[PDB]
């Protein structure tokens, strides 16, 4: 299967353009950055207050992730 | 504004399949869902929501059984392809975004207009057409509440007039229903003076024109 | 979803509507439901969104509340072309899908209301010649276009054999619609009576018919 | 090879124990936290203001690691 | 506080190995740099500085050549591993804390005491000892300045002493100082009264006690 | 490194000594600067750091600055017990290693200085006769202990053959050290005259002999 250090924790599937917030958890932009808006400004997993100053690019993931879009069968 | 715009017909026999696009005005894929819905006449809306890339691991359990609501997209934009067919399968089905995550968001941004998907192999039925008369002066209020019962027909639109079109000017219809059996239901009232009861017997003319079925009943107090 | 809407709500023209929505600590109200409208030969249409917000061209005569732990729409300056099945949304993460209360049908009055005219027309000779029978309820002369309606069988309610239509638009501007019984020539013939019951906002209308009797 | 996602930017060589910046880049902790007050509160790459209240762990890279650490003969 | 503690001796024959620790005190490796550095006799301080893992990938191109310089580390804790080792490997070997990064911040944190590290296969050598007399009274200052100039010799310990011990309070000792040859050299001076230059001649006794070579020469002005 | 650091600085029993330190623009000032104290016979240690930050048990009486475009170190209410080597540290990214100045060695002056007295030895009868001479320059009662010895013969200064000592401590409390330089029979014979020239704070103490001469 593709790994859990590829995966996000809102719709727990693959991530391709990650960013990460002040609690060191990692989500996909593009549904994370509108989810603190259309659910709330709070962190899924611990649930503290977290908006869209505060979450930030994650670029060591981003190039993990490459590693394995560039090559394998999971594309 | 955002706008989607949807493609109409839908009519099939049993077993083909149905292939369509809902247009995308104003952005694309990437960032929300995007998901159909659809609506049976006179019931509520049933599920084909929650996109996950392609297609979806977040469905209504009772729904993808059947030829899997198989509506789901190509290279994620708005399509439906849904295969080997059946009359059960009827709906009005619907394009729009809304949120994401493994989440609606809460909400559904942009509709489209709703394409009619039919699937039938029979041929145009005409109705069973019995008259309706009242039982007394009193109870029908005064005046003569004067009908007929047309049932058991396909497709809905039929034609009921009186007297060979020489009595319209008070003649109402009544709604069609369609029920279980894939037929209508319809019937029509018309108000007449009282002192015609005992003089002049009425005749309703049903004309079923999908099929070419005429035909005339007789309608006095018994 | 968790628990369902209120089917209808009806208020006069110029006056504001208030539909409500329910549901459980994580949906609805804790995280907000959206609010649609659909009416038949329409396309449906998003009115409100997170907390109050509303899409380009939505008037600000709609409103919404997340007060205490429900939602809420408020529809202000009423019209008849507001008239819709209104739908309230949730998402829960116990029911992982785009998931919807019920629908609460918008009724505008822009006349005054009344109770129906109904005649009730026993199973005639035609359809006893052909081994049948239907009991047909014809309901006219009604305002607002809702009723409900119930059978009876000399004194039991009737629950099988049972269908209905939709209402029509009358040339005097009042509704009519339809509810028929399904019998056999023995169940038609066996009994002493039946009878059609039209409830419409506080009084209900029935009409008779006796199976043994002649004119 | 050790990977270049594997490594920091300031020993440049493979991390164990990494935190990410504001700007989304990511150090090993116990050399870049003791450089922030050992050369100063800056950014190692772009240079602007940063100090340890900033500087937060980086979970999905503490992940990768993990993933070759516990199986390749990097060690 | 923190500490550390070196080992001492350090002398070695050539082609030999030097294997010894440094103790860590209140710390270990983990988020410091640990290295050593070195101060030959008479010189300034040279490189072993900032390390990588066990080793270093930033060192002095011009020091790591000959047996590499191999102190690096055990474990990454504090040691020294020098093998096949010669004579212009001799110096003060010195165990710190620092910075980190390819940087060694800009602090040394802690220090050690230095490891005297030394190498030689040669015998204890005695001096060529040589008497040294003033050429007049004006330019000795108006007293006797009297001399000896006691050359290549090692190890660096010898006596100078005058007259068989009787002439001592009188008598001063020069440091020695080592050369690039490997062997030292030293001088003494004695003040006496300048009436005894014309009536007694001085000896002055020389013993590198290391090699017991005892050479003694007279000094007079000529 | 980049630039060097001034050999020594000399300052008196209860004064402030000052210690400079210099580099380019990524190192020893916008890259600070550590100082260090090290004195023959005893261990190595940091003084100031991070601006003027100090390790525990390192007093008031030193302090530091990164003033301008330099690093500096101050130390105030002067001891014999500060006398030591001081060095000044770098790392710049261009030269990426735990380099440093040079180091400035401290003079403390307890007692009044002046310069040595100086008596020059000609090669001796003894050493002839081995086919060898040595012409030796003995300095003694000099404060503070440190002089800079130049060579010359017949008027041109000598720079092969020589060699010197460190100075050792006399029973009165002043200074003595000694120079060197190695002669062949031939060499010491055919001139006319040899001297050594020992500097000392602003004076220079010279003494000569002659080859040609005798007693």
């Known amino acids: 299967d593709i790994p859990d250090y590829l995966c996000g924790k809102i719709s727990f599937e693959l991530m391709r353009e990650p960013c990460i917030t002040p609690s060191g958890i990692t989500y996909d932009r593009k549904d994370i950055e509108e989810h603190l808006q259309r659910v709330g400004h709070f962190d899924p997993v611990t649930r503290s207050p977290l908006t869209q100053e505060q979450l930030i690019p994650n670029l060591a993931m981003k190039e993990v992730i490459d590693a394995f879009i560039s090559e394998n069968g999971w594309v | 504004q955002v706008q989607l715009q949807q493609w109409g017909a839908g009519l099939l026999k049993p077993s083909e399949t149905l292939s369509l696009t809902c247009?995308?005005?104003?952005?694309?894929?990437?960032?929300?869902?995007?998901?159909?819905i659809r609506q049976p006449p006179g019931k509520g809306l049933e599920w084909?929501?929650?996109?996950?890339?392609?297609?979806?691991?977040?469905?209504?359990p009772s729904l993808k059984s059947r030829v899997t609501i198989s509506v789901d997209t190509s290279k994620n934009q708005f399509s439906l392809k849904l295969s080997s067919v059946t009359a059960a399968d009827t709906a009005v089905?619907?394009?729009?975004?809304?949120?994401?995550?493994?989440?609606?968001?809460?909400?559904?941004?942009?509709?489209?207009?709703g394409t009619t998907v039919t699937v039938s192999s029979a041929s145009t039925k005409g109705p069973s057409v019995f008259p309706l008369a009242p039982s007394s002066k009193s109870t029908s209020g005064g005046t003569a509440a004067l009908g007929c019962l047309v049932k058991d027909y396909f497709p809905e639109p039929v034609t009921v007039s009186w007297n060979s079109g020489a009595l319209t000017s008070g003649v109402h219809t009544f709604p069609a229903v369609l029920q279980s059996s894939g037929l209508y239901s319809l019937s029509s009232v018309v108000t007449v003076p009282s002192s015609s009861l005992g003089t002049q017997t009425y005749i309703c003319n049903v004309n079923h024109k999908p099929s070419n079925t005429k035909v005339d009943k007789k309608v006095e107090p018994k | 979803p968790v628990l369902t809407q209120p089917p209808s709500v009806s208020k006069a023209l110029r006056q504001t509507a208030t539909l409500t929505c329910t549901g459980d600590s994580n949906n609805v109200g804790n995280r907000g439901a959206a609010w649609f409208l659909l009416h038949q030969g329409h396309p449906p249409k998003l009115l409100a969104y997170r907390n109050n917000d509303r899409p380009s061209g939505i008037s600000e005569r709609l409103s919404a509340s997340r007060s205490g732990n429900t939602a809420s729409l408020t529809i202000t300056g009423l019209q008849p072309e507001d008239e819709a099945d209104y739908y309230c949304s949730a998402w829960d993460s116990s029911l992982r899908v785009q998931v919807f209360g019920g629908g609460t049908k918008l009724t505008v009055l822009g006349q005054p209301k009344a109770a129906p005219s109904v005649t009730l027309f026993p199973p005639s000779s035609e359809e006893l010649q052909a081994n049948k029978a239907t009991l047909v309820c014809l309901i006219s002369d009604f305002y607002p276009g809702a009723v409900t309606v119930a059978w009876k069988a000399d004194s039991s309610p009737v629950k099988a054999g049972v269908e209905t239509t939709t209402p029509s638009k009358q040339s005097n501007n009042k509704y009519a619609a339809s509810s028929y019984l399904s019998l056999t020539p023995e169940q038609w013939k066996s009994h002493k009576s039946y009878s059609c019951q039209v409830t419409h906002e506080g009084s209900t209308v029935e009409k008779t018919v006796a199976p043994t009797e002649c004119s | 090879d050790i990977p270049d996602y594997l490594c920091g930017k300031i020993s440049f060589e493979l991390m164990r124990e990494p935190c990410i910046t504001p700007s989304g880049i990511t150090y090993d902790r116990k050399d870049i936290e003791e450089h922030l007050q050992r050369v100063g509160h800056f950014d190692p790459v772009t240079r602007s203001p940063l100090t340890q209240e900033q500087l937060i762990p980086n979970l999905a890279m503490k992940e990768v690691i993990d993933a070759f650490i516990s199986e390749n003969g990097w060690v | 506080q923190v500490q550390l503690q070196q080992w001492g001796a350090g002398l070695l024959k050539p082609s030999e190995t030097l294997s010894l620790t440094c103790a860590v005190y209140?710390?270990?490796?983990?988020?410091?740099?640990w290295s050593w550095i070195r101060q030959p006799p008479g010189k300034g301080l040279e490189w072993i500085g900032e390390?990588?893992?066990?080793?270093?990938?930033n060192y002095n191109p011009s020091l790591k050549s000959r047996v590499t310089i191999s102190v690096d580390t055990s474990k990454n804790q504090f040691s020294l591993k020098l093998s096949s080792v010669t004579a212009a490997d001799t110096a003060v070997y010195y165990c710190?804390?620092?910075?980190?990064?390819?940087?060694?911040?800009?602090?040394?944190?802690?220090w050690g005491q230095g490891t005297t590290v030394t190498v030689s296969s040669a015998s204890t050598k005695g001096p060529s000892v040589f008497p040294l007399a003033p050429s007049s009274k004006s330019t000795s200052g108006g007293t006797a300045a009297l001399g000896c100039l006691v050359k290549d010799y090692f190890p660096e310990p010898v006596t100078v002493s005058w007259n068989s011990g009787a002439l001592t309070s009188g008598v001063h000792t020069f440091p020695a100082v080592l050369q690039s040859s490997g062997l030292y050299s030293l001088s003494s001076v004695v003040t006496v009264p300048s009436s005894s230059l014309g009536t007694q001649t001085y000896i002055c006794n020389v013993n590198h006690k290391p090699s017991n070579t005892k050479v003694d020469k007279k000094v007079e002005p000529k | 490194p980049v630039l060097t650091q001034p050999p020594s600085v000399s300052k008196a029993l209860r004064q402030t000594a000052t210690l400079t330190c210099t580099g380019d623009s990524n190192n020893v000032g916008n890259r600070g600067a550590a100082w260090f104290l090290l004195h023959q016979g005893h261990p190595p240690k940091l003084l100031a750091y991070r601006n003027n930050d100090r390790p525990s048990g390192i007093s008031e009486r030193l302090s530091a600055s990164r003033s301008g475009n330099t690093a500096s170190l101050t130390i105030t209410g002067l001891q014999p017990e500060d006398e030591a080597d001081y060095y000044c540290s770098a790392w710049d990214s261009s030269l990426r290693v735990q380099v440093f100045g040079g180091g400035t060695k401290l003079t403390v002056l307890g007692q009044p200085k002046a310069a040595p007295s100086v008596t020059l030895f000609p090669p001796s009868s003894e050493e002839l006769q081995a086919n060898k001479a040595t012409l030796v320059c003995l300095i003694s009662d000099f404060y503070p202990g440190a002089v800079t010895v130049a060579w010359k013969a017949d008027s041109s200064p000598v720079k092969a053959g020589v060699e010197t000592t460190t100075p050792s401590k006399q029973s009165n409390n002043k200074y003595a050290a000694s120079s060197y330089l190695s002669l062949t029979p031939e060499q010491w014979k055919s001139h006319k005259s040899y001297s050594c020239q020992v500097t000392h704070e602003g004076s220079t103490v010279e003494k000569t002999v002659a080859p040609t001469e005798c007693s």
């Open positions: 710190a804390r620092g910075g980190v990064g390819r940087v060694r911040g800009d602090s040394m944190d802690v």
């Open positions: 209140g710390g270990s490796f983990s988020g410091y740099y």
């Open positions: 390390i990588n893992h066990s080793g270093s990938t």
